[PDB]
Write an enzyme that holds these catalytic residues in place. Structure first.
Site, PDB file in Angstrom:
ATOM      1  N   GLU A   1      22.582  90.608 -50.633  1.00  0.00           N
ATOM      2  CA  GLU A   1      21.851  91.382 -51.616  1.00  0.00           C
ATOM      3  C   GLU A   1      21.135  92.576 -51.005  1.00  0.00           C
ATOM      4  OE1 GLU A   1      20.509  88.730 -49.683  1.00  0.00           O
ATOM      5  OE2 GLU A   1      19.597  87.670 -51.404  1.00  0.00           O
TER       6      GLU A   1
ATOM      7  N   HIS B   1      20.406  91.398 -46.782  1.00  0.00           N
ATOM      8  CA  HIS B   1      20.459  90.085 -46.137  1.00  0.00           C
ATOM      9  C   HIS B   1      21.506  89.207 -46.771  1.00  0.00           C
ATOM     10  CE1 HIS B   1      17.115  88.515 -49.033  1.00  0.00           C
ATOM     11  NE2 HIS B   1      17.614  89.691 -49.456  1.00  0.00           N
TER      12      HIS B   1
ATOM     13  N   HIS C   1      14.603  87.418 -61.374  1.00  0.00           N
ATOM     14  CA  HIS C   1      14.003  86.337 -62.125  1.00  0.00           C
ATOM     15  C   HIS C   1      13.464  86.884 -63.433  1.00  0.00           C
ATOM     16  CE1 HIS C   1      13.682  84.835 -57.798  1.00  0.00           C
ATOM     17  NE2 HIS C   1      13.449  86.171 -57.692  1.00  0.00           N
TER      18      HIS C   1
END
Length: 136
Positions: free
Chosen positions: A82, A36, A123
């Site tokens: 990504e 996306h 993250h």
């Protein structure tokens, strides 16, 4: 071809790119979803808004402003995208909507069209906080 890691699982650059090499070049156009467009902090075209920090990689291509629009991959829209690249090396069922396997916290981020692999983001602050590039 070093093994990229985003505090959790490993990510062979070869699979990070190769796992994506299969991924259809397009801003979210797969049975599942991925890959996306990765705004990276941008709105769509213009640079990031007053008050934000994108992911630094070291390339002036990914750092550059993207050219996304209402289509995904219109002309040469050099929009960052990504892709969930697993370490297992299994070609994720990103093309199969159903069933759909669980994604990953690490994905390969490359500019379009030429997949200018910038690195993997995830993250690594705890579990799901801020987004940053892996450490290869």
């Amino acid at each position: 071809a070093v093994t990229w890691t985003c505090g959790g699982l490993l990510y062979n650059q070869n699979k990070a790119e190769s796992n994506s090499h299969h991924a259809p070049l397009s801003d979210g156009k797969t049975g599942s979803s991925y890959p996306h467009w990765f705004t990276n902090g941008y709105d769509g075209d213009g640079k990031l808004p007053k008050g934000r920090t994108p992911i630094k990689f070291g390339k002036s291509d990914c750092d550059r402003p993207p050219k996304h629009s209402k289509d995904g991959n219109g002309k040469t829209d050099h929009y960052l995208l990504e892709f969930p690249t697993f370490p297992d090396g299994h070609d994720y069922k990103f093309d199969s909507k159903k069933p759909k396997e669980n994604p990953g916290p690490a994905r390969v981020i490359y500019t379009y069209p030429n997949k200018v692999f910038c690195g993997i983001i995830a993250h690594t602050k705890e579990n799901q906080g801020e987004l940053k590039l892996c450490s290869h």
